[PDB]
């Protein structure tokens, strides 16, 4: 179903128990220690970062 923060990039991805994607987010201005796993619905138009991670360019 959280406060908005700017995303720098996507570090990793995985499937949850329900078969949907979750993404490990690198938050702009923060280090790897603060990365969090977030479901798709928490990302607001992050298609560019998802494409970069998947290699689409």
């Amino acid at each position: 179903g959280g406060d908005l923060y700017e995303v720098e990039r996507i570090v990793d991805k995985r499937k949850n128990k329900k078969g949907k994607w979750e993404y490990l987010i690198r938050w702009k201005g923060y280090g790897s220690t603060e990365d969090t796993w977030e479901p798709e619905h928490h990302l607001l138009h992050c298609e560019e970062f998802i494409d970069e991670f998947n290699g689409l360019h």
């Binding site: 406060d3 700017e6 995303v7 977030e38």
Partner: peptide, 9 residues
Amino acid sequence: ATKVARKSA
């Protein structure tokens, strides 16, 4: 909005 996301606890 683009390139932002909601962050969990």
